[PDB]
Amino acid sequence: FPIYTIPDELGPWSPIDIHHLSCPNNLVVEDEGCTNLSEFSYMELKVGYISAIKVNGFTCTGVVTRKHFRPTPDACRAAYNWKMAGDPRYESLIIISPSVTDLDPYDKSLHSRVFPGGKCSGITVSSTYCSTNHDYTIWMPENPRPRTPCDIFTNSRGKRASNGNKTCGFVDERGLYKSLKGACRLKLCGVLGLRLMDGTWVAMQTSDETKWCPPDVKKREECLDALESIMTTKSVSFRRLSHLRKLVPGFGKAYTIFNKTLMEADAHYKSVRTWNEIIPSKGCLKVGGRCHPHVNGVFFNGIILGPDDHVLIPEMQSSLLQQHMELLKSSVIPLMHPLADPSTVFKE
Amino acid sequence: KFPIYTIPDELGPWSPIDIHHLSCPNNLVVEDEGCTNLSEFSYMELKVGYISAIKVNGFTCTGVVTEAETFKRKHFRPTPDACRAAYNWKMAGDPRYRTTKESLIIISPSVTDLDPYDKSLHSRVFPGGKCSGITVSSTYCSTNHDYTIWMPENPRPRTPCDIFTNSRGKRASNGNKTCGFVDERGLYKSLKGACRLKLCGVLGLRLMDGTWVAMQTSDETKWCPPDHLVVEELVKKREECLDALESIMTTKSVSFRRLSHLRKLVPGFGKAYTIFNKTLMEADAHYKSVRTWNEIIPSKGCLKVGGRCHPHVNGVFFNGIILGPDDHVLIPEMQSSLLQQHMELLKSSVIPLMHPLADPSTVFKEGDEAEDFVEVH
Numbered sequence: 001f002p003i004y005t006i007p008d009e010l011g012p013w014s015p016i017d018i019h020h021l022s023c024p025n026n027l028v029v030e031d032e033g034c035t036n037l038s039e040f041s042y043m044e045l046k047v048g049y050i051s052a053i054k055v056n057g058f059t060c061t062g063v064v065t066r067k068h069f070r071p072t073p074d075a076c077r078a079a080y081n082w083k084m085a086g087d088p089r090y091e092s093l094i095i096i097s098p099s100v101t102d103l104d105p106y107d108k109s110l111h112s113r114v115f116p117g118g119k120c121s122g123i124t125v126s127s128t129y130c131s132t133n134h135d136y137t138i139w140m141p142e143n144p145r146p147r148t149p150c151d152i153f154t155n156s157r158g159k160r161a162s163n164g165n166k167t168c169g170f171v172d173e174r175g176l177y178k179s180l181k182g183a184c185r186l187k188l189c190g191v192l193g194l195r196l197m198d199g200t201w202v203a204m205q206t207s208d209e210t211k212w213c214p215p216d217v218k219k220r221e222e223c224l225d226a227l228e229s230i231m232t233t234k235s236v237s238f239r240r241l242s243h244l245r246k247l248v249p250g251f252g253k254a255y256t257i258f259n260k261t262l263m264e265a266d267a268h269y270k271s272v273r274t275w276n277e278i279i280p281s282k283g284c285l286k287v288g289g290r291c292h293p294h295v296n297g298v299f300f301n302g303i304i305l306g307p308d309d310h311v312l313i314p315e316m317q318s319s320l321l322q323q324h325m326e327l328l329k330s331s332v333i334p335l336m337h338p339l340a341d342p343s344t345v346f347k348e
Numbered sequence: 349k350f351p352i353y354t355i356p357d358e359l360g361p362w363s364p365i366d367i368h369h370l371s372c373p374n375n376l377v378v379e380d381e382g383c384t385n386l387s388e389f390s391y392m393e394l395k396v397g398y399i400s401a402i403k404v405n406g407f408t409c410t411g412v413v414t415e416a417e418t419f420k421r422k423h424f425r426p427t428p429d430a431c432r433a434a435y436n437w438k439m440a441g442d443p444r445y446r447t448t449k450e451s452l453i454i455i456s457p458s459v460t461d462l463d464p465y466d467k468s469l470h471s472r473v474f475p476g477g478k479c480s481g482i483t484v485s486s487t488y489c490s491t492n493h494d495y496t497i498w499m500p501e502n503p504r505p506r507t508p509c510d511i512f513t514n515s516r517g518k519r520a521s522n523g524n525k526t527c528g529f530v531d532e533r534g535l536y537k538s539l540k541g542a543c544r545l546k547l548c549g550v551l552g553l554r555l556m557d558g559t560w561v562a563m564q565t566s567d568e569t570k571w572c573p574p575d576h577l578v579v580e581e582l583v584k585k586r587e588e589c590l591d592a593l594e595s596i597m598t599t600k601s602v603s604f605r606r607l608s609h610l611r612k613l614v615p616g617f618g619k620a621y622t623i624f625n626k627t628l629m630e631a632d633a634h635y636k637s638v639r640t641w642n643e644i645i646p647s648k649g650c651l652k653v654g655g656r657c658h659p660h661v662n663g664v665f666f667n668g669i670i671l672g673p674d675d676h677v678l679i680p681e682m683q684s685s686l687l688q689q690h691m692e693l694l695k696s697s698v699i700p701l702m703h704p705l706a707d708p709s710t711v712f713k714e715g716d717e718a719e720d721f722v723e724v725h
Binding site: 017018019059061063066067068069094096099112113114132133134135136137233234235236237238239257259260261262314317318321323324325327328329330331332333334335336337338339341344346347 | 365366367368408410412421423455458472473491492493494496599600601602603604605608623626627628668670672673678680683684686687690693694695696697698699700701702703704705706707708710712716717718719722725
């Protein structure tokens, strides 16, 4: 159990609603089957495409001068293009960007709490729009006539680790073993592979007939308490934000806040032995061998620039002050000999 | 109404005590409404380390005999000469403890106070601080244990009267009758409630805070014994020191945290406590206030007292202050303050933005009037 987890590689920052928040995974398969190795090159998803294939988009809401009306796609698109820069366009049509959706790999479906039940199933070139919870707004893609992206993989080198002919799993480019037990089969951009139970995908063939992925000392009690608190108050705090950080190595989300807009990014978390290997310099938070940059004093996961341009990590300080005060709560015994007035005893 | 902390202007030597020497501070303030015009002058006060009392170090001699036949040891009343000679070996030499062997087991340290009138020794090893003292004739004292005697760490001659120091100050008088002064530390001490005392043939007043001074302009006023304005904060802060002392004596144990409560919260004379290796110890202190933690911790491991970085002894300073593993001075009051800040900024929430149409619970209007989110465009 490490003292902290730091992402080895930060993915892109995509904005989210508080409803997208979820508690960490915390899996420790730990082999126990394989004591053999070999250098092989596996294929995985790039950070940014691991959790979901994000389709950027936007919402077009129709206004008449006020009253409402359901607009048409063509005019709405015309609005977007004349709104990414200063342009004459200013019955009026309002857009909001971005309205990100999560593309389903089964059927080109799009899941978003802006759709009724994450309803939009697909968008061939016969609809060009997509219904919304609002009867007078439509959702459309950031790019017109887009298609599924397929430059989403990366070649990486790891170790196979099989027991018999059967593959127990492997060791990723980060050095962490991952187990194939409990994984399902998934085909992405035609390539056949497996979705592991941590959420990662890898291109492999198993001689074990597996299922197919369906379309849908614990601290999790503390996590869900902190989280349900957020949904009950619609407000987030940098301590409750600290329970969302995965506590053990492996794939997870990293959260942050820009312009009071909650955001998440894919991350491979690695163990930390000393705080020093994370913060060598003063204002340096070392992510992947570099002083990670910030915006106006915030890094991800509640890590923020303190009141002195000092990298202030929450768990670091909490553990520190805990240790200091704990040093101050140590008891001792003074050594009086005949002070009380009790009697005639020998006393060693 | 209290300064954030209080640090000695200069410490006295350290004296070994037990938990029963522990007393709560006397956070006493003094106004003396008048006394506006101060006359620059010089006064004589007690040297730091003698203000409360004049300690005299000593040791306890217990005599026991062992009968090996299977041991059946018992006591005997020892002799002063052999106890002294064995004590002198306890420092450098080698002491050792049907056949029988007699043995003098020595206990150090045992400290007693001295009344300068009788030249008498007061302590709780005696019957009510009994010993008239030591002479050339009498070389020992009688303890509550019939087979145990007390003898000083020093030979019999101990003429003690080099206890004074001449300091500068300002005698604020008002017009007619001197009513107060300010010491070298720059703190107002008032004569309201002082009582006389003669020490080494020098008459002088002992004030309420405990300081003795060489001033006779009290006019005629009552002696000290042989031994209206109190804000709620003083009392409601005194009670927790009483709860902490009660906790200490009930538990027979001490900790740096519980030790920090006995600190004097306002400037003036007071006691400073600490513990080194299971040995509880105390020292005289002229406390002065602190405004910001920077002025008593300027460097990474510097505890500024008396114009210099104070030296620890195995990482323990005083008043619960110890040295952190990062070689950082850490003060109980300062660390608790820092915990309040650290959490009160962790305990700080914000309401992040919500895509108006991404909230499934947003009920849209009946009819066709506009919503509010589009007003912001």
